[PDB]
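P.,

For your records, the input lines for the assembly:
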Amino acid sequence: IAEFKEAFSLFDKDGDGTITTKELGTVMRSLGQNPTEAELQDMINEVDADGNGTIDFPEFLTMMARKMKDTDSEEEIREAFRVFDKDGNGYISAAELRHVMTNLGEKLTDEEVDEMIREADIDGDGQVNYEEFVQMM
Amino acid sequence: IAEFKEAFSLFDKDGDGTITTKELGTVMRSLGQNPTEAELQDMINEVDADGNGTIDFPEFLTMMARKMKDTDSEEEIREAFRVFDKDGNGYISAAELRHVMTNLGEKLTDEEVDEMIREADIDGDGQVNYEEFVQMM
Amino acid sequence: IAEFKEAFSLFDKDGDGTITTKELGTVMRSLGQNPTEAELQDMINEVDADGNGTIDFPEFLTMMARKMKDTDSEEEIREAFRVFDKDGNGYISAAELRHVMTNLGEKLTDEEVDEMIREADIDGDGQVNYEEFVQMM
Amino acid sequence: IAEFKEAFSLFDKDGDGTITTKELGTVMRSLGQNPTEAELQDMINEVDADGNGTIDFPEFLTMMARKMKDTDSEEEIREAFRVFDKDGNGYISAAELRHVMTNLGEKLTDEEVDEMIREADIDGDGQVNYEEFVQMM
Amino acid sequence: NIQGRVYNFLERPTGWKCFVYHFTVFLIVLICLIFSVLSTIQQYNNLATETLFWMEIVLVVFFGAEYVVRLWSAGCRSKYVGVWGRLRFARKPISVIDLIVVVASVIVLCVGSAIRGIRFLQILRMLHVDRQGGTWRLLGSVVFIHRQELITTLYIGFLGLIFSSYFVYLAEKDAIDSSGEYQFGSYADALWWGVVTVTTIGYGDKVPQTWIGKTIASCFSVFAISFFALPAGILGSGFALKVQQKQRQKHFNRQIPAAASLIQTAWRCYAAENPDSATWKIEHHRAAIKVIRRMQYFVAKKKFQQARKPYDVRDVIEQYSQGHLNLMVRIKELQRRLDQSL
Amino acid sequence: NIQGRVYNFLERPTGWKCFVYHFTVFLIVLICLIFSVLSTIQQYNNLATETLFWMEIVLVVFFGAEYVVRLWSAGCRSKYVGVWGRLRFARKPISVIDLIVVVASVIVLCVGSAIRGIRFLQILRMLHVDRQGGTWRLLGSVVFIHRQELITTLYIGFLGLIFSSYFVYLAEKDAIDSSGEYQFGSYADALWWGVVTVTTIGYGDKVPQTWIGKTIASCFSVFAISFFALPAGILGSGFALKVQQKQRQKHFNRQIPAAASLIQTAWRCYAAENPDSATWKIEHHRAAIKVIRRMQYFVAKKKFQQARKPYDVRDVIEQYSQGHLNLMVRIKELQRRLDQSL
Amino acid sequence: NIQGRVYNFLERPTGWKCFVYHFTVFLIVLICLIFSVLSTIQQYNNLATETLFWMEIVLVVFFGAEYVVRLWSAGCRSKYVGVWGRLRFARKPISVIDLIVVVASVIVLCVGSAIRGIRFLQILRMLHVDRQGGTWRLLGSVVFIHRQELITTLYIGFLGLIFSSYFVYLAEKDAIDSSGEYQFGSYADALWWGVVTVTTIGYGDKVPQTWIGKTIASCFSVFAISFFALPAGILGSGFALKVQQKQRQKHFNRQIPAAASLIQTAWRCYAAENPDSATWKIEHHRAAIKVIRRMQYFVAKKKFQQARKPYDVRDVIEQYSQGHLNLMVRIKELQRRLDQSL
Amino acid sequence: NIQGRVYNFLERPTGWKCFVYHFTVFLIVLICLIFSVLSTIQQYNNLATETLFWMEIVLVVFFGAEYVVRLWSAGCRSKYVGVWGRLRFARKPISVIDLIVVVASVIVLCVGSAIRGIRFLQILRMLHVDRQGGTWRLLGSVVFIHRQELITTLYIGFLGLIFSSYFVYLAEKDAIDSSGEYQFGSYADALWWGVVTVTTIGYGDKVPQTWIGKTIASCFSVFAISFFALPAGILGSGFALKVQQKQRQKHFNRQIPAAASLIQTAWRCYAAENPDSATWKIEHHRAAIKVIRRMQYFVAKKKFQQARKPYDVRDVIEQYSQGHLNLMVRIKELQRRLDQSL
Ligand SMILES: COc1ccc(-c2csc(NC(=O)[C@H]3CCCCN3S(=O)(=O)c3ccc(C)cc3)n2)cc1
Ligand SMILES: COc1ccc(-c2csc(NC(=O)[C@H]3CCCCN3S(=O)(=O)c3ccc(C)cc3)n2)cc1
Ligand SMILES: COc1ccc(-c2csc(NC(=O)[C@H]3CCCCN3S(=O)(=O)c3ccc(C)cc3)n2)cc1
Ligand SMILES: [Ca+2]
Ligand SMILES: [Ca+2]
Ligand SMILES: [Ca+2]
Ligand SMILES: [Ca+2]
Ligand SMILES: [Ca+2]
Ligand SMILES: [Ca+2]
Ligand SMILES: [Ca+2]
Ligand SMILES: [Ca+2]
Ligand SMILES: [Ca+2]
Ligand SMILES: [Ca+2]
Ligand SMILES: [Ca+2]
Ligand SMILES: [Ca+2]
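Structure tokens returned:
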């Protein structure tokens, strides 16, 4: 509860009580992510509960309230992994997973790829059971 | 009747007998509203009876002829207040109404918000019956 | 037949055997109409039989081949006049016709408006029978 | 197999192992075709198997794997020639074919037009059987 | 103006006055039809003949007066002027129907009084309420739009009916039923049964008796009832799509500039023929002027057609391509101007 | 708050509690109806009268209590306040149906005990489950949307029925069947047969006997069964398109700014009437202010209507035209500024 | 040219001459079929045999001449050249049908004269009017498009029919009706009744007698008539959507550039194989050239497919994304040039 | 790999081998069902019992072997691992159906031999061909999508049936027919007649006799047959629209980047919980990082959902608004830079 106000005020940096696209972009630049205006607008739309155009503290509270472990979220992750999964089965090669994670879509580095494969392929095999991986998540 | 010609000529300021987007924008700037070209075009489209692109005196007369107290207009206001109204009931908190009026959509100031709440919540209660408010309107 | 080649070559002015948007625009500017690129493109699309992008002599011949007196064209003119015609009848006031011709859509001058009303209202009455006018056309 | 790597590396010119729109455009400029960004994007989309945005060596291998002699491709060529073919029959005049090839769509020169007509009209007649031409292809 | 008002009140209803007038006329016609049914009933003829005759006289006088006043008021519109215009209006099928009903009723009541005319005229006069053709016109438009699929359905259904009826006729040609009567005595009877089954009525007077006939009837029924009920679904989906596009149409204020442009271009083309005219305000130059005016007329006609037709994705993409080309041209002009400056 | 909660639980179900409550009530009503059917069966009346009476007493007490508590809870919403508001709520047809059922059951059980009331009241009370009208409202909306085509279909079908029935009546007026009974004794019987055939029921009690009648029946059946089954297809396609557009609608977070703007503009227009008010923050100037506020109200109303209505290609093209005009104006401004500089 | 004209007049009707020719041929075939029905009628055979034989001789001679002239005229198109091309044309099902009808009629009239051939040949020759397959092709296309849902409907309907028929057979296995006959004597009879009920025919020869059977029949009828009438609605909606998209298609002048580009790219790819050719106008360079030509061929094929297919929102969004990327790139170029200048 | 290949060949057919295998199995089941029908026929039991028993033994052995091999091959997919995974696979309804059929057939043939099991098991085993549920799943999806309108139709139809049946029962309660039997002896019989009429079957066993009953039946038939045939049209239009949107869907190469982004964002959010991890590559800063990662996860999920869902006008307008805002911002930046320079 208390940390929510501090986190909300952390993005503020001006004490106006409201978060805007420019404010979030400046915070992201200070962090060092180098975002774009389209990404900023998409994020503001996705977190904006009412849709007025800015981010309010009640909206931030609602966004914190909605979280992981949702059945819909687990199903979405499962079917995304299935789409990545050829042969219609539940197994994908570690090399193929590494290649797709490091090239396709978002870019990842060697250390995070190694952590991902370590957390996924717990056993010493060339395949990863994404169902059990998601269940572990 | 006579005031319609004076009002129509007031927006003219050039005696050409026709109102255009630039003319209306200049009038709005002189008034001090600071509008935009999109708003000007939308207003011209909404008042333009034939749709040629400009505003004529017969069109202004028709716009004056169409007015409030319409059953459709009352229904529209009622359902807008219902959309603003949570719990599906007919009551909304005065604080919530003040917040939504001052932040969401059009911006309003303290004096006009006070007048609105005074005209709405006639009795000393924290709820406003928008049905009776619209009927009073 | 012979005049078609001369007319086609008149728009050419460069002897390349093909009419283009820029060529037609230059011809229109020399005539003194002051057109726009959108109008030029629409005209080229409407006269372009194959749709390649330019105007050929066979296409000009086809355009000359298609002409007035078509039943579809007469019906189109009739229903356009009906749309201009209030009361659902076949009669429109001469003053209303003059106003709509001089203001709405294409602009016309006093002499051409006078010729139009003279050719339409043959009899000394304040109404014009557009059916008989089109039949006379 | 070996020539595929050399051909893929030929478009590379930078040894990064991936072909991009700018790289392909530079290769095309060096060749001397003078392309456009829209054409480059369309080509990249058409050869991009996954759709990430760039061209990979497995995608180039798949593109090489898919080739001519397909029944769908032959049917497409046949119906395109039929669309070019008036009278609903299978014969088109050599002069009309020459005109459409040299003017409509892609531009061709005298030598290539002569080669095309020589390969199409094997016999000394003014008509070309596009069915037999495609079968010969 | 009174002529136009009465013509509107009698042929183009707009208010509750015209609505109640038409409703009362239709209700009177329906009451007369019901009394005709009662008269046709063998036990209720003597007590109904007199009232039927009186109501017929009243209704024929009323319809004669209505037809006379409608003919008088038909001259409001410019299309109907003078004797020739009145004749052109009377040539319309609804006016022809009214005239035929009036003359037949008058001659029948002059002859009379047992006659089938006093009933068939009521049957035909129940059709008089279809003023302006606002129903038959819609039905014909939809049928003409769907003609290809409707003909396909009719042909497939008829061919299946013929073939299956012949097969069942071969199957049960000599199948005597319990009542000692040949259920399928001839291909005509078999075809009647086939029509009944494909129309999914099932009277039950003719039913197959042998197992071959039963199997053939079952298979053909399952594979042809869909085809013989297809027009209902086709017309229903057509009506729904038509009303959806009707509610999706643009407002009537977006057609006025297009109509104005079309009329102006047509007038310019017409005046181009006359050498001495006021249209010559901005030999070979005259030919160029008339060609340009013809092109303007064509483009105006196309624009009017597109504006009248409901908005489409092809219209959207065309307009966007035009705007994008304009923006690209202007940006190219700015680029070349900047290059010239620097 | 408890009043609002109980009103929601009794009239606007939202959870499994309300779902199971309504399901149990409907199941009890259905059980009572089945027992009424058993009582109406001549052989199962003495063993069912007592249980029917007891269940009727229990159910009438339960429904009286439910109506009383619903009337008490109807005051949660602002529309129903005081005696007048409670009367306005009771004026609703469903409340009227419940009150009529309650009073009729009470008076019937006070009089009683062979009576048709104890069954017709169950028949009418099976309708009580249609709370909020979430079914009849949808049906009425779709019928009113498709009214034109529905009326066209009804008129064409009725006219075809009448004409074909008369033709068949003329064909087989004197066709004695095997059982020695006139199949078509009168136009009334012929019309009954026509209704049966167009509705595609085929009872078989009246079947044509002469070949002229058979041919006419076949042709008219093939050409009119589609029209008399058309409303099913029309309503089905309408329902499918309506649900497709419902699933295509925009989210509820896109209507809030439009509603806010509409309310603000309406309040500004209302306050413009009062001369001394806080709304005078940015004679002739007052008239200009009120005209501008009226224009803002109109444009806000139109924007709200467009936002509420599902997205359309006309909305897309309008928005693109607005954006393109904005971009063109700004590029023109940049061009003129550059020309001024150089 | 006369060969092409006669082929068009005989197989691809375009004018009222061909329309009236086909109408007359179809009317003659229908008249012959009606006379065959009259002959099959037991009381109208002696007075119709001679005219049937004469009309059959005339029609077989006419159809033989028509087939001969059609075979002669089939050589206009390039696909049919020489003996092999004529054989390929004759291999088409319609030509096969005509040849079979001709040979069967000739052999039947040579043998003859009571025979079923003189009627079944008329039944099969009523199919000859379906020239070019403009009906069966459309039906097959729609069925193949909807195959998944059609198979789902057929499977669900058949399974429901089987299960409900078995349940009713168990219910009324020993239910003797009034006429002293077992209505459901075996599962075969119960299955016949089930087929009748699901097809919604209702012959009435077999009707349930026990209350369990009546209840099961009612429930299954209400829950399966919709499924067994589903194909009618599916095909109707499919036809309506197909005709809507057909009327929404782009004009034929928007496919010409795409076809030209496809042909040019295909020819370039073909000529790339030959080392010495005129196509080498702008080893490793040759491989790059052929790869680029292959890519051009693929993109041209995709563009042609998109142009041929009716305009879609995906096409609109793709084109807008391309244009927006172009504009963004050019604006970036202008920005970098301005930064370099200043 | 052989386990996966055999699982694909036995449960997810892809080639003509699997197609012909399933076709042969279904044909054998259908042949066994036909022989069971012949056995149920009273005159064809002694000559069919032995072959029915032999075919049943062969088929039960074959299906036991098929179930065993399917259970062995179900371990290819990761969802089914070990004993618990095999049990989870067997818990699926189709596997349950197969197991029940196998055990019932084994116990029946061990007991046996006149029994209804040898037929009801065939009836239930005809359902075994519905592998993967590719039919029932589609039907359930469409029904769940249209549930609101389907419930509305069912409720309106049932209420109309009840009310009209009661009215007709009141009309013809004492109408003795020609055969001296009460056509409507009780409300149960009247309700059976009402069900028959609304389902449009028309058995003809119960037909109204009095004119009041005939009129009520006609009016209610015309006004309720459409409602009781509505589900056919609703489901047909739903299937057609679903297949149209299916053919309008985007290609599978447009979902890969969205899935990649979703997986990456989910992994980042998961790793944010662990303090010491490699994800900390670009206290309060940690909270900001995790909030930003949560926002990225949400936007990636929304983008993936939009990409998976077929393209829509709302998607088009959203994308255009984003692009227009980007262009406007960049043009504003250029304008302010130019103003600063000059
Ligand atoms: C619910 O169960 C189903 C499942 C599928 C359908 C369905 C839709 S379309 C279709 N094709 C048909 O009904 C076509 C094509 C396939 C063979 C049967 N005919 S033929 O009778 O017209 C017919 C009859 C006689 C002659 C001389 C020619 C043609 N069959 C209907 C109900
Ligand atoms: C599968 O085979 C087919 C093929 C086509 C159709 C079909 C669709 S629309 C249509 N036009 C009709 O059914 C219209 C128009 C054409 C003539 C017949 N009527 S009338 O009976 O209403 C009728 C009856 C009595 C009176 C006094 C007036 C009008 N006929 C139906 C089934
Ligand atoms: C107007 O009143 C209405 C209301 C709703 C509908 C409706 C639409 S879809 C649907 N689902 C059905 O009809 C499905 C699913 C629900 C249970 C009944 N079946 S089963 O008979 O096919 C059937 C029969 C036998 C066997 C062995 C398996 C399946 N029921 C129909 C009419
Ligand atoms: Ca802020
Ligand atoms: Ca907000
Ligand atoms: Ca693993
Ligand atoms: Ca002006
Ligand atoms: Ca205006
Ligand atoms: Ca209040
Ligand atoms: Ca040129
Ligand atoms: Ca051209
Ligand atoms: Ca005049
Ligand atoms: Ca690269
Ligand atoms: Ca790639
Ligand atoms: Ca050749």
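Two observations worth noting. Residues C 16, 18-20, 23, 54 surround calcium ion (ligand 10) (CB under 6 Å). Chain B touches chain F through 50 residues (CB under 8 Å).

Regards
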